[PDB]
Structure 1
């Protein structure tokens, strides 16, 4: 997901502006749905929501627009159990042996013959929660097991939280409402208001451990691999309690990252750290936010956002619709010169030609160079010390950069990587005259619609994830509900689309209508005022009661 909030100091109109570009599945239980909700006099909000949830998840109201992105904070901890040496169904806390609880669930299963069988399954639970097994990493043997404590299992506030957000007036009110309830499970919140405030909040439900306990309570090897793992044999490693927190064992709001500015804030799924590089967010618990290298989507956004120039609505729109493969900026110049050094190489010719002709984009009309680039990058990612300029914490916006071609081994390995990528591409048997839009599609009935965009890991702001199905790449997730909100005098102006359309049902008139538009990248008014709604020639009305 991407989010950009722009304030009074940077917007062309001196007022707030928000780009919401959440990246979600195109099917299933997290498929967004557009709706506008009004209880006249006290609720008037529009945006998108998730299946079965009667509140707006991402949206806007008269003076406010907000969105969310998945954060990097932990929302659970694993606990390594020290098992009772005499009994692997018992575990030690402060040297005292405790029994696991056994909870059986019963499931009905439909067999080939069409009849139901009952299956019973035992779920083992510790004081922390259920045991979990990852064979070869988190085993359950005679020495240890792992239990999982999920912080959101006790979060009964989640629905109230979004209902409250839906009632928020401006950025200050939104901040108050979220900090007061702490009901947001696992996302950042970014927002802008008419007065030109831009807000970033890493305000979610995060396990709390006081600073002094982290060194002793962490499992070092597992934490080093990105898992929030704690010592479950020591009662002192229970989540800490702080009366200010809305829920026992979670981090109080004052200790979670917030940035309130009048220029901009952004997030593309990295930590709070470089939300705005002018004001870095630092000194938080590692369970909350770490100073880790930013992904290429964020690096891309910051490269377009840094500076003094006014930001227009058009600018933010074009950051999505340009489909620029930003990762090419760091590697493609040096790759092309390797290509020019190896023109006598038969196995490289087609790749090098396709890469040289490529527009560095993931547009419908982008050439096969994008495919060659993707397969090369999957191999480049595996090489050691291949960056000319490796990540520099002092230069977090401009590194890593370039290929270390002057180093003999790197040159060999990068050439081999390109040779192997080219082999993979040409083995797939697709023609060279084929463009990206000929490959990446969304099926609608028996028909297919070409879809622009590409994987977020290659720095395409318009992130689209796809998989091989038949002869094409079938879109499964990415750019979903798009909303770009400004605040001119008459009321909020919202512009966007729901990429996959309102209805998942092939029979609906709204199964593919916005998907055709998404393909052509033609965003539309999201009508919010009675005037805008009334102006729509497609307007239909039904009143219902029982």
Structure 2
């Protein structure tokens, strides 16, 4: 997901502005749906929601717009159990042997013959939560096992939290409502209001350990691999209690990152750290936010946002619709120099020519250079010490950069990587001259629709993930509900699209209509006022009722 909120010090109109670009599946239980909800006098909100939820999850109201992005905080911890050496179904806490609980579930299974059979299955549980096995990493042997405590299992506040967000008036009110209930499970919140405040909150449900416990309780090797793993044989490693937290054992709201600005805040799924580099967010629990190198989408966004020039709605829209492959900025200039140094290598000629021609984008008409670049990058990623300028913590916006071509080993390996990628691409059965939109599509009945964008890991802000399906790349997730909101005097002006269209049913008139628009990158008005709704010549009305 991406989000950008702009305030009064940087917007062209001196008021707030918000770009919401969540990247979520195109099918299933996380498929967004647009709707506008009104209880006259006290609720009037529009945006998009997830299946089955009677609340707006990303949206806007008269003076406020908000969105979310998946955060980097941990929302569970693993506990390494010390098993009782006499019995692997018992584990030790403070030296005392405790039995696992066994909860059995019964499932009905339809067989080859069409009959049902009953399958029973035992779920083992510790005082922390159920046991989990990852063969070869988190095993259950005679010495140890692993249990998992999920902080959102006791978060009964999640629907209430978006009901409350849906009632918020402005950014101060949104912040009070979220800090008060702490019902957000696993996203950041970014918002702007008409008055020109830009807000970032990393306010979600996060296991709490007091600072002195963190180094004491960690399993060092697993934490080094990114797993929030704790010593489960020591009762002192229970999540910490603080009366200010809304739920036992979660982090109180005052200890979670918040930034309130009048220039901008942004996030593309990195930590809170460089939300706005003019005011770095540091000094939080590592369960909450760490200072890690930011990914290419955020580096892209900050490259467009930093500086003194006013930001227009069009500027934010075009950050999405440009489909710029920002990772190419870091590697393509030195890669092309390597191509020029090897004009005699016949095996490289077609890739070098494609890469040279390429518009450095993931547009429908972008040439095969994009595909060569992706396959090259997948190999470049595996090389060691190949960056000319490695990540520098004092230059987090501009590193890593460049290929270290002056090191003879690197030149050799990078050239091999390109030859490998070139052979891989050419071994695929892709028609000569095919462009990116010929390859990447979304199927609708037995038509396809060409879909622009590309993988967020290559720094394409319009992130689209696809999978090979027969002769094509079928879109499975990415840019989904798009909303760009500004606050002119008459009322909120919201523009965008639901990329995969309102309905998942091929019979519906709304199965592919916005997908055609998304293909052409033609965003539309999101009508909110009674005036905007009535001006629609497609307006249909129905009133329904029944007894309770």
**TM value normalised by structure 1:** 1.00
Q: Deviations over 1:375-405 (max 9, x none)?
A: 0000000000000000000000000000000
Q: Deviations over 1:93-135 (max 9, x none)?
A: 0000000000000000000000000000000000000000000
Asked if 1:377 is matched to 2:377, the reply is yes
Asked if 1:50 is matched to 2:50, the reply is yes
Q: Deviations over 1:5-52 (max 9, x none)?
A: 000000000000000000000000000000000000000000000000
Instruction: Provide the alpha-carbon RMSD of the alignment.
Output: 0.3
**Alignment partner of 2:396: what SS?**
coil
Structure 2 CA distance for aligned equivalents of residues 431 and 150 of structure 1:
48
Q: Deviations over 1:34-84 (max 9, x none)?
A: 000000000000000000000000000000000000000000000000000
Structure 1 CA distance for aligned equivalents of residues 213 and 50 of structure 2:
38
Structure 1 CA distance for aligned equivalents of residues 162 and 199 of structure 2:
17
Cα drift, residue 142 of structure 1: 0.1
**Alignment partner of 1:131: what SS?**
coil
Structure 1 CA distance for aligned equivalents of residues 200 and 353 of structure 2:
44
Cα drift, residue 506 of structure 1: 0.1
Cα drift, residue 432 of structure 1: 2.7
Structure 1 CA distance for aligned equivalents of residues 432 and 93 of structure 2:
63
**Alignment partner of 1:90: what SS?**
strand
Q: Deviations over 1:255-297 (max 9, x none)?
A: 0000000000000000000000000000000000000000000
Structure 2 CA distance for aligned equivalents of residues 432 and 207 of structure 1:
53
**Alignment partner of 2:131: what SS?**
strand
Structure 1 CA distance for aligned equivalents of residues 70 and 424 of structure 2:
33
Q: Deviations over 1:358-384 (max 9, x none)?
A: 000000000000000000000000000
**Alignment partner of 1:348: what SS?**
helix
The range that moved more, 425-434 or 2-11, is 425-434
Structure 2 CA distance for aligned equivalents of residues 198 and 525 of structure 1:
23
Unaligned runs of at least 5 residues, structure 2: none
**Alignment partner of 1:132: what SS?**
coil
Q: Tell me what 1:367 maps to.
A: 367
**Alignment partner of 1:517: what SS?**
helix
Structure 2 CA distance for aligned equivalents of residues 404 and 129 of structure 1:
48
Cα drift, residue 329 of structure 1: 0.1
Structure 2 CA distance for aligned equivalents of residues 390 and 446 of structure 1:
47
Q: Deviations over 1:217-262 (max 9, x none)?
A: 0000000000000000000000000000000000000000000000
**Alignment partner of 1:294: what SS?**
coil
Q: Tell me what 1:353 maps to.
A: 353
**Alignment partner of 1:106: what SS?**
strand
Cα drift, residue 483 of structure 1: 0.1
Cα drift, residue 460 of structure 1: 0.1
Cα drift, residue 429 of structure 1: 1.7
Asked if 1:486 is matched to 2:486, the reply is yes
Unaligned runs of at least 5 residues, structure 1: none
Cα drift, residue 431 of structure 1: 2.1
**1:98-117 paired onto structure 2 within 5 Å:** 98-117=98-117
Q: Deviations over 1:202-223 (max 9, x none)?
A: 0000000000001110000000
**Alignment partner of 1:515: what SS?**
helix
Structure 2 CA distance for aligned equivalents of residues 376 and 83 of structure 1:
47
